[PDB]
Design an enzyme around this catalytic site. Structure first.
Site, PDB file in Angstrom:
ATOM      1  N   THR A 160     -12.003 -50.035 -35.570  1.00 49.75           N
ATOM      2  CA  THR A 160     -11.473 -51.316 -35.992  1.00 49.75           C
ATOM      3  C   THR A 160     -10.108 -51.209 -36.635  1.00 49.75           C
ATOM      4  O   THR A 160      -9.530 -52.242 -36.939  1.00 49.75           O
ATOM      5  CB  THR A 160     -12.456 -52.008 -36.928  1.00 49.75           C
ATOM      6  OG1 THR A 160     -12.771 -51.102 -37.985  1.00 49.75           O
ATOM      7  CG2 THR A 160     -13.728 -52.427 -36.225  1.00 49.75           C
ATOM      8  N   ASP A 188      -3.356 -43.157  -6.855  1.00 52.69           N
ATOM      9  CA  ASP A 188      -2.174 -42.651  -7.549  1.00 52.69           C
ATOM     10  C   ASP A 188      -1.545 -41.534  -6.710  1.00 52.69           C
ATOM     11  O   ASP A 188      -1.613 -41.561  -5.479  1.00 52.69           O
ATOM     12  CB  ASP A 188      -2.570 -42.257  -8.984  1.00 52.69           C
ATOM     13  CG  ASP A 188      -1.446 -42.368  -9.982  1.00 52.69           C
ATOM     14  OD1 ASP A 188      -0.485 -41.575  -9.891  1.00 52.69           O
ATOM     15  OD2 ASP A 188      -1.510 -43.256 -10.832  1.00 52.69           O
ATOM     16  N   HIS A 200       1.525 -37.462 -12.380  1.00 52.62           N
ATOM     17  CA  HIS A 200       1.142 -38.769 -12.889  1.00 52.62           C
ATOM     18  C   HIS A 200      -0.342 -39.049 -12.668  1.00 52.62           C
ATOM     19  O   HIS A 200      -1.032 -39.504 -13.584  1.00 52.62           O
ATOM     20  CB  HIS A 200       2.052 -39.808 -12.224  1.00 52.62           C
ATOM     21  CG  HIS A 200       1.885 -41.207 -12.658  1.00 52.62           C
ATOM     22  ND1 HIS A 200       1.027 -42.073 -12.038  1.00 52.62           N
ATOM     23  CD2 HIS A 200       2.547 -41.933 -13.567  1.00 52.62           C
ATOM     24  CE1 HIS A 200       1.144 -43.268 -12.567  1.00 52.62           C
ATOM     25  NE2 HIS A 200       2.056 -43.216 -13.513  1.00 52.62           N
ATOM     26  N   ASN A 214       6.337 -51.906 -16.819  1.00 54.75           N
ATOM     27  CA  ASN A 214       7.128 -51.353 -17.902  1.00 54.75           C
ATOM     28  C   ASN A 214       8.538 -51.940 -17.946  1.00 54.75           C
ATOM     29  O   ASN A 214       9.502 -51.230 -18.197  1.00 54.75           O
ATOM     30  CB  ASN A 214       7.241 -49.841 -17.797  1.00 54.75           C
ATOM     31  CG  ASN A 214       5.903 -49.144 -17.658  1.00 54.75           C
ATOM     32  OD1 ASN A 214       4.902 -49.506 -18.259  1.00 54.75           O
ATOM     33  ND2 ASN A 214       5.865 -48.123 -16.830  1.00 54.75           N
ATOM     34  N   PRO A 222      -4.775 -62.784 -10.647  1.00 57.94           N
ATOM     35  CA  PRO A 222      -5.623 -63.226 -11.753  1.00 57.94           C
ATOM     36  C   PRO A 222      -6.987 -62.560 -11.828  1.00 57.94           C
ATOM     37  O   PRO A 222      -7.525 -62.421 -12.925  1.00 57.94           O
ATOM     38  CB  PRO A 222      -5.770 -64.739 -11.547  1.00 57.94           C
ATOM     39  CG  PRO A 222      -4.560 -65.100 -10.736  1.00 57.94           C
ATOM     40  CD  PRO A 222      -4.288 -63.920  -9.835  1.00 57.94           C
ATOM     41  N   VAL A 233      -8.147 -59.536 -11.252  1.00 54.00           N
ATOM     42  CA  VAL A 233      -8.281 -58.157 -11.714  1.00 54.00           C
ATOM     43  C   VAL A 233      -7.931 -58.095 -13.194  1.00 54.00           C
ATOM     44  O   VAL A 233      -7.545 -59.074 -13.796  1.00 54.00           O
ATOM     45  CB  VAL A 233      -7.451 -57.208 -10.853  1.00 54.00           C
ATOM     46  CG1 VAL A 233      -7.874 -57.324  -9.402  1.00 54.00           C
ATOM     47  CG2 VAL A 233      -5.970 -57.426 -11.014  1.00 54.00           C
ATOM     48  N   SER A 277       0.967 -47.359 -17.357  1.00 53.96           N
ATOM     49  CA  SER A 277       0.180 -46.429 -16.567  1.00 53.96           C
ATOM     50  C   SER A 277      -0.844 -45.662 -17.396  1.00 53.96           C
ATOM     51  O   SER A 277      -1.833 -45.211 -16.834  1.00 53.96           O
ATOM     52  CB  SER A 277       1.069 -45.407 -15.855  1.00 53.96           C
ATOM     53  OG  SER A 277       1.781 -45.916 -14.787  1.00 53.96           O
ATOM     54  N   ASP A 305      -4.774 -57.836 -33.990  1.00 53.46           N
ATOM     55  CA  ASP A 305      -4.321 -56.681 -34.733  1.00 53.46           C
ATOM     56  C   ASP A 305      -2.956 -56.180 -34.271  1.00 53.46           C
ATOM     57  O   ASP A 305      -2.359 -55.375 -34.977  1.00 53.46           O
ATOM     58  CB  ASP A 305      -5.410 -55.615 -34.738  1.00 53.46           C
ATOM     59  CG  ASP A 305      -6.667 -56.129 -35.422  1.00 53.46           C
ATOM     60  OD1 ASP A 305      -6.529 -56.757 -36.489  1.00 53.46           O
ATOM     61  OD2 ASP A 305      -7.767 -55.932 -34.876  1.00 53.46           O
TER      62      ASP A 305
END
Ligand SMILES: [Ca+2]
Length: 279
Positions: free
Chosen positions: A16, A39, A69, A161, A175, A177, A224, A260
């Site tokens: 938390t 990938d 990657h 990114n 939408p 996924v 990623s 948060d």
């Protein structure tokens, strides 16, 4: 179970609060689930995978990960030290070349491959696909991701990114996924993370330690890196019976840590993936 001196992102997903270093999880650890990592490939021989990883498809002259990657992402899903779901089965689909590039037609073929290939695998607790890739908007790419999800696979995709609205990128903008943004160890949105209404969830994405090629490790950053945290979490929760592939993104959002994160633009969810594990 408790893993001391865990990578920060693992600790974050079971807490938390930021600023802790132990990962807490149910010992079932995703056993009986499967995660496809679509990938650059996976270095399946890495000791961290313990024989639980295998390459199942390539569209290039080799199935090896000559980039790193895909190995890094697979490690965050399911490596023994660096992974969320330490007992899942990992399947690699090499749609990206060793420079990290791929044609959309090849990426689409790889998604349709997974939708079929899961019928050749033993995954009684469920099937996840992790897609740490994307490019400009394409309705065909979005449709392929939607088909894969429809087929009974929990699809997690990177937001991208560009520090921009993810509506202009694919498959991020689909939408149906689970579109994943990135946060840092201080609970800030990562500076590069895309945002917008199409995001579903954030996960750890800045300075993420995981496996690399040549039997090594390294820390890198990106949406990623956030995506496989969510993919691994889905596999873990499916093994526990708490959700299903169709509902897992929604369940993760429902059970997330709320409010948060800092520097979340108005209109983007403020939700951080959380396993809700109580030792
Ligand atoms: Ca969504």
């Amino acid at each position: 179970a408790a893993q001391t001196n865990a990578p920060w992102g693992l600790a974050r997903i079971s807490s938390t609060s930021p600023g802790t270093s132990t990962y807490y999880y149910d010992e079932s650890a995703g056993q009986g689930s499967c995660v496809y990592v679509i990938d650059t490939g996976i270095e399946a021989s890495h000791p961290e995978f313990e024989g639980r990883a295998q390459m199942v498809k390539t569209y290039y002259y080799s199935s090896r990960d000559g980039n790193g990657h895909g190995t890094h992402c697979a490690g965050t899903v399911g490596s023994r030290t660096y992974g969320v779901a330490k007992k899942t089965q990992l399947f690699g689909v090499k749609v990206l070349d060793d420079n990290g590039s791929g044609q959309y037609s090849t990426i689409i073929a790889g998604m349709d491959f997974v939708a079929s290939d899961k019928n050749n695998r033993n995954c009684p607790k469920g099937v996840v696909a992790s897609l740490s890739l994307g490019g400009g908007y394409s309705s065909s790419v979005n449709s392929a991701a939607a088909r894969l999800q429809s087929s009974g696979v929990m699809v997690a995709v990177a937001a991208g990114n560009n520090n921009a609205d993810a509506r202009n990128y694919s498959p991020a903008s689909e939408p149906s996924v689970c579109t994943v943004g990135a946060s840092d160890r201080y609970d800030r949105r990562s500076s590069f993370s895309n945002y917008g209404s199409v995001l579903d969830i954030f996960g750890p994405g800045t300075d993420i330690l995981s496996t690399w090629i040549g039997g090594s490790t390294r820390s890198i950053s990106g949406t990623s890196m956030a995506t496989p945290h969510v993919a691994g979490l889905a596999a873990y929760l499916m093994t526990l019976g708490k959700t299903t592939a169709a509902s897992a993104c929604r369940y993760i959002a429902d059970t997330a840590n709320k409010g948060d994160l800092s520097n979340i633009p108005f209109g983007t969810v403020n939700l951080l993936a959380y396993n809700n594990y109580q030792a």
